[PDB]
Amino acid sequence: EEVLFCEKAKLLIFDSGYTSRGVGELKLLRKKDDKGKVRVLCRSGMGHVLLNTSVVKSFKYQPIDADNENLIKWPIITDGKLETFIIKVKQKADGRRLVGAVADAQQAM
Numbered sequence: 001e002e003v004l005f006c007e008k009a010k011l012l013i014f015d016s017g018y019t020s021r022g023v024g025e026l027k028l029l030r031k032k033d034d035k036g037k038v039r040v041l042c043r044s045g046m047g048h049v050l051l052n053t054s055v056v057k058s059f060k061y062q063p064i065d066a067d068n069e070n071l072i073k074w075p076i077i078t079d080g081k082l083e084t085f086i087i088k089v090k091q092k093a094d095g096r097r098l099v100g101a102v103a104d105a106q107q108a109m
Helices: 092-108
Strands: 002-014 018-031 034-043 049-054 071-078 081-088
Touching: 002 034, 002 092, 018 049, 018 092, 034 092, 071 092
Parallel strands: none
Antiparallel strands: 002 018, 002 081, 018 034, 034 049, 071 081
16 A cells, blocks of 8 residues: 555544544555555554545545635545545645545546
C-alpha cells in the first residue's frame, strides 16, 4: 500500500447532533498491485482504528460547503443504510487536498 494523503483528523458521527469519536492520523491508501483498492484508515497512542473503509466510485466526498472546506462529508454504508461521517481537519487547504486526493484516486480506479 501507498500513502496518498496523511493528516491528523477528528472523526465526527451523528448521535440521536454530531459528536467526536476520536482524533487520529487519517491516511488514504491504495494497494501497489491494484489501483481499484483504495481505502481510508484513521488510527488514534492506543492505535484504535476509528475508520477503515473503502472509497466507493459512486460517492462524492466533499466539504459540507464552501464555508467549511475543512469538514469533509464522508458517506458510508452501514447495514445498507447511507450515513455521513464528518472528517474534521485543522486547516482548510488540508480539506481541499483530501478532496482532491480522493477524486484523483477515484478517476484512477
